[PDB]
Design a protein around this nucleic acid. Structure first.
Lengths: 53, 49, 53
DNA sequence: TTGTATTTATTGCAATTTTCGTGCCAATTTCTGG
DNA sequence: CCAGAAATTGGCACGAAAATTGCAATAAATACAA
């Protein structure tokens, strides 16, 4: 009983058009963003504490 | 299908309620024998070990 | 020297990173090895010598 | 015309530890002539 | 067949080289006020 364990690669190396090419694994590359809704209220009209925060 | 020599009559209750009585000569001549093909697959993968 | 960085950065980057190649999955640190001298002035990697043994 | 507060742009040096190859030699296994 | 001799192996050592980790806050370009 039991199944083998695997590992997700971070870098992929292939041979395209006779040349060895290297790329990152798009299925595991970390990424982030900026919340536009929260960042749209950075104005001096509101309280200064909110602005500095 | 196949061309079958048929008669319309009751035979001792063996064609009761849409039952069909078939001769042994039909079986011996392989007139309704069929071929079935099945596929199986084995996959060898790469592990960390 | 090839990428114009410090070997500390190269050491940190290649830690616990995996690469997928047609030959299999290899840790990025698998490609660094010692060597033993070869007649003719060349060098032979210890990985190649282990495979030959 | 300039002097200054603000926003991007900075992913290396230097100890310290760990690993490398190869020699010395005792314990262990194998070979050979009388 | 036997006992001496030769070959094998791996533990410890030693110098050197390679890899790992601690350090924690600045420097320069840009826009604005007299």
């Amino acid at each position: 009983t039991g199944e083998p364990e695997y590992v997700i690669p971070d870098v992929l190396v292939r041979k395209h058009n006779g040349h060895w090419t290297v790329e990152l694994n798009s299925d595991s590359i970390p990424r982030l963003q900026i919340n536009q809704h929260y960042a749209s209220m950075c104005n001096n009209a509101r309280n200064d504490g909110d602005s500095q925060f | 299908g196949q061309n079958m020599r048929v008669a319309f009559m009751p035979w001792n209750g063996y064609n009761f309620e849409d039952s069909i009585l078939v001769s042994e000569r039909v079986v011996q001549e392989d007139r309704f024998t069929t071929i079935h093909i099945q596929e199986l697959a084995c996959v060898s993968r790469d592990t960390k070990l | 020297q090839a990428v114009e960085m410090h070997e500390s950065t190269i050491s940190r980057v290649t830690t616990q990173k995996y690469l997928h190649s047609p030959r299999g999955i290899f840790e990025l640190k698998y490609f660094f090895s010692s060597h033993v001298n070869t007649e003719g002035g060349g060098e032979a990697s210890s990985t190649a010598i282990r495979a030959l043994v």
